[PDB]
Write an enzyme that holds these catalytic residues in place. Structure first.
Site, PDB file in Angstrom:
ATOM      1  N   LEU A 165      47.130  -2.984 -22.110  1.00  0.00           N
ATOM      2  CA  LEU A 165      46.290  -2.497 -23.194  1.00  0.00           C
ATOM      3  C   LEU A 165      45.293  -1.472 -22.668  1.00  0.00           C
ATOM      4  O   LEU A 165      44.900  -1.506 -21.501  1.00  0.00           O
ATOM      5  CB  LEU A 165      45.544  -3.649 -23.870  1.00  0.00           C
ATOM      6  CG  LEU A 165      46.330  -4.935 -24.131  1.00  0.00           C
ATOM      7  CD1 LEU A 165      45.390  -6.106 -24.349  1.00  0.00           C
ATOM      8  CD2 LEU A 165      47.272  -4.769 -25.307  1.00  0.00           C
ATOM      9  N   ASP A 166      44.899  -0.546 -23.540  1.00  0.00           N
ATOM     10  CA  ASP A 166      43.888   0.441 -23.197  1.00  0.00           C
ATOM     11  C   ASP A 166      42.517  -0.031 -23.688  1.00  0.00           C
ATOM     12  O   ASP A 166      42.353  -1.163 -24.149  1.00  0.00           O
ATOM     13  CB  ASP A 166      44.274   1.816 -23.745  1.00  0.00           C
ATOM     14  CG  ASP A 166      44.365   1.845 -25.255  1.00  0.00           C
ATOM     15  OD1 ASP A 166      44.254   2.943 -25.838  1.00  0.00           O
ATOM     16  OD2 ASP A 166      44.572   0.777 -25.857  1.00  0.00           O
TER      17      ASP A 166
END
Ligand SMILES: CCCCCCCCCCCCCCCCCC(=O)OC[C@H](COP(=O)([O-])OCC(O)COP(=O)([O-])OC[C@@H](COC(=O)CCCCCCCCCCCCCCCCC)OC(=O)CCCCCCCCCCCCCCCCC)OC(=O)CCCCCCCCCCCCCCCCC
Ligand SMILES: CCCCCCCC/C=C\CCCCCCCC(=O)O[C@H](COC(=O)CCCCCCC/C=C/CCCCCCCC)COP(=O)(O)OCCN
Ligand SMILES: CCCCCCCCCCCC(=O)SCCNC(=O)CCNC(=O)[C@H](O)C(C)(C)COP(=O)(O)O
Lengths: 178, 459, 124, 88, 80, 67, 98, 128, 110
Positions: free
Chosen positions: D42-43
């Site tokens: 995930l960012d």
């Protein structure tokens, strides 16, 4: 509140803070859950539409325009968590917080009740009195000649050391003292 | 009235003949007994005064002041013995001697039948106060404070003496009874105007009048606790008593003459109340509050009506008690933390609950909550001023607001909020301090129960 | 409402003034008028301690109602007839006041129109 | 009475419960020690959304400076326990 | 006391406004990854609620029945 | 009466609170209906409001625009 | 992003110390070591105060003029007075607007 | 694009609306680092005494002492009679006195003149 | 006014205590079924505040309004009284709609 702040915020940090503020105020405007989900997904798409901009000057200009739009369109009465710095119960339980050193002033009649608690308290006081000099020595050795650049503190590294400057963090009164 | 004067002169050698560890006990017990004896002066007549002899007389205006003085002495004794523990025996006896001499001078001042004897005693009260301030004060500015306390007084009182002797060369007597019975009007001439100013400005500087008040913050902040108590409780009331006495010979010149002092008093009560809102020192706030209340009393005496005189008497007694209580309250915290900064120690209601209750009662009485005698005197003065001119209700009204603000401000800064983290030496309150607060506060409500005893001779 | 519109937007002269009323003699248009009578004596109203505003021409019904309420105290639902008579008397009084207002209005209208017509006739 | 004495097991259960309801993280591969950026990939925006979901779940707000450092569920539960004085 | 959390797989956006929000998002190329975190606000005993007029007329049925029976009793009580 | 939390389900309810709520709403509505039936004039008025236009000139004592 | 190893380790150490301190705050079963009719309320709180008040009003307050003043009772036509026995006449033959 | 916000004295400018925080320079970064270093040194100095087991009393703050001294005792030594100081002192210390004197004198002259003519409605005026 | 105003504040406090000291109406969902007694009490209080006929608020508010309408008075004051008595029903509707109708918006620990 727990972490030592840095000298400045980086571009990504300001971007993320604006993202969180915009989401919270949009939720304040969109009371119902489905409408909020719709408009929050729209905001996320609008937000990552310029995610791959390699020009930092245009990135800062976009951030500035976004902040101007946020300030114009903010909610004058946004939702605040009750215990947050603006909530309706922010500092409600501060008057019930009493520091631990007050327990030293109790009458011996008052200390006759709760003997085991005060025995444990004496153990804790002995531990702190023994650990203080080692904490001071560790802080002296680790720190640079000029001084400490940040507010971060080192951990214990030796066999039976305690982290320096621990007494007033560990012995916090409580969140709901009474 | 030697039955009260002689026991104090006997308090002197009892103190100087006491054992090294029994001075406070003996002084307190016998001061309380003297106060009980002096309580008999309250049985006053309705037409004339109690004329004891050719030298001393008791009026309905002076008896409550005498009772207040004799009651205040044991309170100062109780308050002083904490910070004088490390002092040597001889210096403790000297301090007690200074307090006893001050009480004796005040007792003899409030009952002198002649104006010149009143002047001599009202000026003799200066020496013990100055010695106390400049010797047992704590900081270095005390010396300067002493000078401000001295010359500010004398520059006002030296002309009065001249006027006094001049009057005796014209009328032949300074006896207050003969002066009252043989009163004659004052003409409108420059000589009479300057006679008026000479007779009035000493008492004005004693109150003090706004613009002539710069000595008071210094003297009341730099003095020890007993010095502050006696300065705020009784010594300010000498000016009011003297003015109420001397105004009997200044009519009808008073109507023309009073205007500048009335405007100074009203605008100065406004200004001093405003000053109290921004004060970083806790003792200076109480000093300026005293200035505001005394300005109200000045207006009351100056407009010269019966209701105004009753209001002045009630307000003087009430302010004496309230200011002494507030100074003692501040001194408790100062003795704990050795500093007078108001924001240094916060959230003391958490650590000292009963002390916070005392703070609340003192602040409530300062802002004249009904039916306390503070409010009785204030309301009588306000009604008299309204009769004098309907516009005064503006300025007085503004005062009634600002006062409350700063009073509650003081409380909110000291008792509420969160405690200072690094101050870890707030010991529990002693029995002595709580008893001092209770002995300050109970007589106030007891007096409210029977208000005609402090309403003066015009009742 | 309509009278307010007729007066504020309408000519002021035609409309009656509530503060200054009546402006015509009481027996102007009538050949004869009966004097309105009062049933309750001043002494009775003083003893009943009615009010300075309730001592109108309907005071007798109010006295009857107060007596009935006092007599039938625990039954606070027993004084319905007397209440109705007092209300009806008040309604008649209000209707008569409306009659007086309308009388002043149409008298003013007719008088001003007749004066203007006579002036026009005499002007030619 | 008032709310029960919240425990560490309850905090962990609720944090995981919120996490498996995120459509972008598969439930089976998720573990208590899974790093948000390495394992789940995930960012930063997803991390912000996770922090807001945690705040809504537990009814209080975590400041951004502290929220940035939380990168696996164990850190989330440790922060919650420290904030609310949970030791059992 | 001593109850565990419900199974997390029962939360679906089927038959909820979240369904329509997701459909409208799909018409724009977006997707909503948090609906299952809100499905509990529509799934169980919160499925349906009254309207404003329905809330105002809460106890109208029983009250009207009592009023009608009381009036009917009154009409055939004056027949004495 | 011991009621426990639910965690994303409808809370538990006891029959007494529903009974009391329904009873109180019912008596409110019954009182409104009964009072309207017995005191209708308190809302619709009692006495007819007259219309002044239908008042004769003779009744108001106004001369026929001649004198 | 995230904690550094030093911050993480210091957090674990402080957190364990804090849990220990909070654990030590419990009370053992003996900690508070304490050292060594039905209608009475209506009598001490209603009946006695009303006795005192009634005695004070009846025998002290009333003993002075104009201390308790009551407005005159209302008088209506047709009423009879207790003291004098006088009756009040009726009211002027209502016109009977039936 | 949107209506603009204008700062005032009692409603200041937000940090996110500040153009100085969006056009930054390495000099600004060095200044921020120096400010953080100063703050960190002060914080360490405070915390060393705060956590001292043997410390009983209050931790004296030179900043508070400087604040009180500057607000109280450093004012007169730094006072110079200037045109601004003289004008402000004269105004704020003279104008209100004569304003109130004129108001009260006019009111009392009016009242005395009315009393002399015998038309003030002083009935029931027993207490004064 | 004393009766139903005190009761309305009491019901608001009941809601606040139930929802973990939360006071914002934006985090109150469907309490019509979850809080029956509080719901009926608040509904009755709101209906009394808006002067529903034959309730407690009627016997004073209705008479006040009809006395203002039938007196020699300022016109702007009459208009403002009427607009205010409309806004009263408006904000009562706001409270009921946002607090008792709809779907839950409070945290999941019920
Ligand atoms: C009206 C009631 C009538 C009651 C009849 C009997 C009353 C006897 C009272 C005796 C005198 C009061 C005590 C004063 C010293 C404080 C003592 C103390 O340390 O308390 C700790 C003690 C032990 O508790 P604790 O656990 O240690 O708690 C300590 C903590 O710090 C926690 O402390 P705390 O938070 O409890 O703080 C104490 C508490 C209370 O403490 C106080 O503030 C006392 C001072 C009250 C206000 C003073 C400023 C106003 C001056 C008015 C002067 C009136 C004089 C009347 C004659 C009095 C003669 C003594 O603070 C307050 O609650 C706020 C007070 C607000 C007062 C507002 C009153 C306005 C005027 C009322 C009407 C008066 C005239 C009535 C007739 C009117 C025409 C019909 O608690 C008490 O004993 C109760 C306190 C007393 C409250 C009474 C308040 C009303 C009575 C006023 C004075 C008496 C009047 C009698 C005639 C009727 C009036
Ligand atoms: C910290 C502030 C305190 C300072 C205030 C001191 C000022 C007091 C006011 C001045 C008092 C001087 C008067 C002395 C006593 C006068 C008694 C008297 O009645 O004598 C008059 C005479 O009056 C005088 O001689 C007074 C003249 C003044 C001389 C001294 C001047 C002092 C300063 C004057 C201006 C100060 C104004 C007040 C102070 C303002 C505040 C700064 C009558 O005498 P005869 O000659 O017999 O007249 C009748 C037959 N021809
Ligand atoms: C409700 C009323 C107020 C709401 C109105 C708000 C209006 C603002 C909407 C528009 C905001 C924008 O798009 S402003 C667009 C700003 N553009 C950039 O930042 C380009 C560079 N991108 C990066 O540095 C990273 O990818 C980063 C994005 C930080 C993520 O970091 P991570 O991946 O490592 O987590």
């Amino acid at each position: 509140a727990f972490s030592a702040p840095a000298a400045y915020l980086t571009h990504q940090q300001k971007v993320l803070r604006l993202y969180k503020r915009a989401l919270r105020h949009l939720e304040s405007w969109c009371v119902h859950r489905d409408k909020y989900r719709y408009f929050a997904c729209l905001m996320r798409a609008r937000f990552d539409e310029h995610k791959n901009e390699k020009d930092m000057v245009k990135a800062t200009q976009l951030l500035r325009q976004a902040e101007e739009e946020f300030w114009y369109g903010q909610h004058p009465q946004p939702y605040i968590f009750p215990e947050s710095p603006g909530g309706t119960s922010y500092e409600r339980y501060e008057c019930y917080k009493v520091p631990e050193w007050c327990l030293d002033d109790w009458h011996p009649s008052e200390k006759a009740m709760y003997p085991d608690y005060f025995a444990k308290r004496e153990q804790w006081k002995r531990l702190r009195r023994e650990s203080w000099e080692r904490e001071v020595k560790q802080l002296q050795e680790e720190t640079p000649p000029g001084g400490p650049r940040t507010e971060a503190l080192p951990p214990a590294r030796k066999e039976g050391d305690l982290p320096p400057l621990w007494w007033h963090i560990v012995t916090r009164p409580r969140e709901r003292p009474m | 009235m030697l039955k009260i004067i002689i026991p104090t002169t006997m308090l002197l050698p009892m103190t100087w003949m006491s054992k090294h560890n029994m001075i406070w006990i003996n002084a307190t017990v016998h001061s309380l007994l003297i106060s009980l004896i002096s309580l008999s002066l309250l049985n006053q007549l309705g037409e004339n005064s109690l004329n004891f002899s050719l030298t001393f007389f008791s009026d309905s205006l002076s008896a409550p002041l005498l009772v207040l003085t004799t009651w205040l002495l044991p309170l100062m004794l109780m308050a002083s013995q904490s910070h004088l523990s490390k002092e040597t025996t001889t210096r403790k006896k000297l301090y007690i001697t200074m307090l006893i001499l001050l009480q004796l001078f005040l007792i003899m001042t409030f009952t002198a039948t002649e104006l010149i004897l009143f002047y001599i005693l009202f000026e003799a009260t200066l020496v013990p106060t100055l010695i106390i301030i400049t010797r047992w004060g704590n900081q270095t500015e005390r010396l300067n404070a002493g000078l401000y306390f001295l010359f500010y007084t004398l520059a006002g009182s030296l002309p009065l003496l001249v006027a006094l002797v001049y009057i005796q060369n014209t009328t032949g007597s300074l006896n207050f009874l003969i002066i009252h019975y043989w009163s004659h009007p004052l003409s409108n001439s420059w000589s009479n105007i300057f006679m008026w100013l000479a007779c009035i400005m000493a008492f004005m500087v004693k109150m003090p009048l706004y613009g002539l008040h710069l000595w008071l913050p210094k003297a009341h902040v730099e003095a020890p606790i007993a010095g502050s108590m006696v300065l705020a409780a009784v010594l300010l009331k000498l000016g009011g008593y003297g003015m109420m006495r001397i105004t009997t010979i200044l009519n009808p010149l008073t109507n023309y003459m009073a205007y500048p002092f009335l405007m100074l008093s009203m605008w100065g009560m406004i200004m001093t109340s405003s000053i109290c809102l921004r004060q970083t020192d806790l003792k200076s706030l109480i000093a300026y509050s005293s200035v505001s209340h005394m300005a109200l009393v000045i207006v009351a005496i100056m407009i010269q009506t019966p209701w105004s005189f009753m209001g002045a008497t009630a307000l003087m007694i009430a302010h004496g008690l309230t200011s002494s209580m507030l100074f003692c309250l501040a001194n408790t915290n100062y003795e704990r933390v050795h500093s007078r900064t108001m924001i240094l120690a916060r959230g003391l209601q958490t650590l000292l609950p009963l002390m916070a209750t005392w703070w609340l009662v003192a602040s409530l009485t300062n802002l004249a909550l009904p039916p306390s005698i503070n409010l009785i005197g204030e309301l009588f003065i306000i009604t008299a001023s309204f009769s004098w001119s309907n516009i005064t209700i503006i300025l007085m009204g503004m005062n009634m607001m600002i006062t409350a603000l700063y009073s509650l401000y003081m409380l909110i800064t000291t008792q509420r909020g969160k405690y200072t983290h690094h101050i870890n030496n707030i010991k529990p309150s002693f029995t002595r301090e709580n008893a001092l607060m209770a002995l300050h506060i109970l007589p106030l409500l007891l007096l409210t129960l029977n208000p005609k005893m402090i309403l003066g001779p015009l009742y | 409402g309509a009278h307010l519109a007729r007066r504020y937007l309408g000519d002021a002269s035609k409309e009656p003034d509530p503060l200054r009323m009546p402006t015509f003699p009481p027996d102007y248009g009538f050949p004869e008028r009966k004097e309105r009578e009062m049933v309750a004596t001043q002494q009775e109203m003083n003893d009943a301690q009615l009010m300075l505003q309730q001592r109108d021409y309907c005071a007798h019904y109010l006295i009857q109602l107060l007596k009935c309420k006092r007599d039938s105290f625990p039954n606070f639902l027993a004084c319905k007839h007397e209440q109705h008579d007092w209300d009806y008397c008040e309604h008649l009084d209000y209707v008569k006041r409306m009659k007086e207002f309308e009388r002043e209005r149409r008298l003013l209208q007719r008088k001003k129109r007749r004066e203007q017509r006579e002036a026009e006739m005499a002007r030619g | 009475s008032d709310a029960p004495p919240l425990t560490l097991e309850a905090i962990k259960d609720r944090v995981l419960y919120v996490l498996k309801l995120y459509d972008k993280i598969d439930p089976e591969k998720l573990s208590v020690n899974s790093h948000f950026m390495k394992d789940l990939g995930l960012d930063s925006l997803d991390q912000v959304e996770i922090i807001m979901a945690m705040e809504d779940e537990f009814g209080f707000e975590i400041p951004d400076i502290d929220a940035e450092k939380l990168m696996c569920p164990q850190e989330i539960v440790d922060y919650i326990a420290d904030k609310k004085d949970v030791y059992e | 006391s001593k109850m565990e959390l419900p199974d997390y797989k029962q939360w679906k956006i089927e038959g909820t406004p979240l369904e329509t929000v997701q459909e409208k998002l799909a018409a724009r190329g977006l997707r909503d990854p948090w609906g299952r975190n809100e499905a509990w606000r529509y799934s169980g005993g919160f499925a349906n609620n009254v309207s404003f007029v329905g809330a105002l007329l809460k106890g109208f049925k029983w009250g009207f029945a009592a009023f009608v029976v009381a009036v009917g009793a009154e009409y055939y009580l004056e027949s004495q | 009466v011991h009621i426990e939390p639910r965690y994303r389900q409808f809370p538990q309810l006891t029959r007494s609170q529903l009974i009391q709520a329904e009873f109180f709403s019912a008596t409110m509505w019954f009182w409104i209906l009964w009072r309207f039936w017995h005191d209708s004039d308190a809302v619709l008025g009692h006495f007819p409001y007259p219309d002044p236009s239908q008042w004769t000139d003779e009744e108001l004592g106004i001369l026929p625009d001649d004198e | 992003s995230g904690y550094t190893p030093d911050e993480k380790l210091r957090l674990q150490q402080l957190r364990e110390l804090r849990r220990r301190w909070l654990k030590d705050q419990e009370l053992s079963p003996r900690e508070p070591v304490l050292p060594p009719r039905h209608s009475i309320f209506a009598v001490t709180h209603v009946l006695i105060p009303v006795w005192i008040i009634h005695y004070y009003l009846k025998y002290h307050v009333t003993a002075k003029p104009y201390t308790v003043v009551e407005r005159k009772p209302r008088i209506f036509p047709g009423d009879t007075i207790l003291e004098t026995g006088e009756v009040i006449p009726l009211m002027k033959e209502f016109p009977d607007q039936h | 694009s949107f209506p603009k916000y204008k700062p005032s004295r009692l409603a200041t400018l937000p940090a996110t609306l500040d153009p100085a925080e969006y056009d930054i320079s390495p000099e600004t970064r060095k200044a921020q680092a120096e400010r953080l270093a100063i703050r960190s040194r002060l914080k360490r100095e405070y915390l060393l005494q705060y956590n001292d087991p043997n410390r009983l009393g209050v931790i004296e703050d030179p900043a508070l002492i400087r604040w009180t001294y500057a607000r109280s005792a450093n004012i007169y030594p730094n006072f110079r009679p200037t045109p601004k100081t003289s004008l402000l002192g004269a105004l704020f210390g003279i104008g209100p006195l004569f304003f109130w004197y004129y108001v009260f004198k006019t009111d009392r002259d009016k009242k005395e003149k009315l009393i002399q003519e015998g038309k003030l409605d002083q009935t029931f005026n027993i207490s004064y | 006014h004393a009766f139903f105003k005190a009761m309305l504040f009491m019901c608001s406090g009941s809601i606040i205590h139930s929802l973990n000291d939360e006071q914002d109406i934006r985090k109150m969902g469907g309490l019509y079924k979850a809080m029956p007694f509080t719901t009926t009490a608040l509904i009755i209080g709101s209906l009394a505040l808006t002067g529903m006929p034959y309730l407690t608020g009627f016997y004073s508010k209705d008479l006040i309004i009809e006395a203002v309408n039938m007196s020699y008075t300022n016109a702007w004051a009459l208009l403002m009284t009427l607009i205010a008595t409309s806004l009263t029903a408006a904000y009562s509707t706001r409270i009921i709609f946002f607090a008792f109708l709809g779907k839950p918006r409070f945290p999941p620990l019920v």
